[PDB]
Amino acid sequence: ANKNMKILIVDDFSTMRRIVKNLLRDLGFNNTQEADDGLTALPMLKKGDFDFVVTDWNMPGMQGIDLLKNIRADEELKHLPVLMITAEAKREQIIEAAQAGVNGYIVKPFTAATLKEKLDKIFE
Ligand code: BEF
Ligand SMILES: [Mg+2]
């Protein structure tokens, strides 16, 4: 588990990207960059050579679910682990993200404790 892997934090809420960034720093990860919607994340992922994606769901531009499908439906981006963070706690929606290929999930609000937990869970 590289602690200097390039990570993209996607969320329409700036403060949330901010919180995620610091929790990640707390766990020994400071190579984070941001995108405020799935529409701005894609082009970044398209040439940024990121290693990990943490994405919100509910986003006006391109919903987090659609972003993961684009990442998956893309031969150069389909190995990217994706942790979905979001308020949508409905099982039917978690299922949907699972079928779409997400690697992990985590419901807002969460702590550094819970985050690290999820991260380790993901690396496979
Ligand atoms: F905006 Be995410 F669905 F919390
Ligand atoms: Mg949102």
Swiss-Prot record:
Question: What does the record list as GO biological process?
Answer: archaeal or bacterial-type flagellum-dependent cell motility; phosphorelay signal transduction system
The record's principal subcellular location, in a coarse class, is cytoplasm
Domain of life of the source? Bacteria
User: Which residues does this entry mark as bearing 4-aspartylphosphate?
Assistant: D56
The record's keywords, sorted A to Z, are:
Cytoplasm, Flagellar rotation, Magnesium, Metal-binding, Phosphoprotein, Plasmid, Two-component regulatory system
**Which Pfam families has this protein been placed in?**
Response_reg
Cystines in this chain? none
Tell me how the cofactor is bound: Binds 1 Mg(2+) ion per subunit.
Instruction: State where Mg(2+) binds.
Output: D11, D12, D56, N58
Q: Supply one GO molecular-function term.
A: metal ion binding
Q: What outcome is recorded for mutants in which this gene has been deleted?
A: Defective for chemotaxis, but remains flagellated and motile. Out-competes wild-type strain in mouse small intestine infection assay.
Compartments where located: Cytoplasm
* NCBIfam families, alphabetized: PRK10610.1
This chain's function reads: Acts as a response regulator to control chemotaxis. Involved in the transmission of sensory signals from the chemoreceptors to the flagellar motors. Switches the flagellar rotation by binding to the flagellar motor switch protein FliM. In its active (phosphorylated or acetylated) form, exhibits enhanced binding to a switch component, FliM, at the flagellar motor which induces a change from counterclockwise to clockwise flagellar rotation.
Q: What is this protein called?
A: Chemotaxis protein CheY-3
Where does this protein come from, organism-wise? Vibrio cholerae serotype O1 (strain ATCC 39315 / El Tor Inaba N16961)
